[PDB]
Structures are given as C-alpha cells and as structure tokens.
Amino acid sequence: TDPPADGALKRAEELKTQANDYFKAKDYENAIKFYSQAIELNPSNAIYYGNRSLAYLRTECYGYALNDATRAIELDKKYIKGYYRRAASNMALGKFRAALRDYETVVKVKPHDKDAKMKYQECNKIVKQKA
C-alpha cells in the first residue's frame, strides 16, 4: 500500500497532537499508546517513534526508548530531535560516549541551539567526569 490516505494520516497527525496533549497531561503511557495508534495509521514517522521513545524516556523505559529512538532515525534519517531521543536513550543507559556522538551530531547541525548544546555539553562534561 502507498502512504495511507488523508483522514487516516491526519488522524495519525491527530494522535500526535493527542499524545502531545497526554504528555502535557503528564501521562506518557497514553502518549505512548496514542503514538502507537498513530503507527497503526501511518508507519514511517520519526515523530511518532521519537516521542514514543521520549515517553519511554520519561518512564525510564530506556530499553524501548533506545529501540524506538533508533527506529525513528530509520524512518526519518534526518530528524534532529530524533537523534536527540536516541542520544538521551544512550545517555540514560550510561553510554555517555555513545550519547555524546549523537548529541555531538545534533550540536553540529544547530550549534546555535542551546537546546542541542545543553545535552551535548552535559554529556561531554560527564565524559570528563570520567576523566
């Protein structure tokens, strides 16, 4: 099948928004759920997997987080916030050098963004904490 049609896709877009509304509601698993429902509607959206892993990242489900974050990068090979998700996954897992590599890439794309810098430098300093 081609990309699912409008209503279906826009509803996946909806569940993106609804799950965002659940993240705003501080419920990451419903966010996880609605994002999964969005994966039922469309597939190749790093947005869905990225914030799903981000939700797992909130619920310290880093095993799933690392999977889904990496999965997003497979769906949208260039998604800056997607690398950021995978980076956080590695970072939280204790892979500071691995996370640094991803964070580094993010800060190499937008070094003007302290939102990217922050976690880069945070991982970087922690590498130095390790000597």
Binding site: K16, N20, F23, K24, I47, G50, N51, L54, K81
Partner: peptide, 5 residues
C-alpha cells in the same frame, strides 16, 4: 512550549 514533536 508545546513543540514536543
């Protein structure tokens, strides 16, 4: 803000 995605 709201830009989770």
């Amino acid at each position: 803000m709201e830009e989770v995605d």
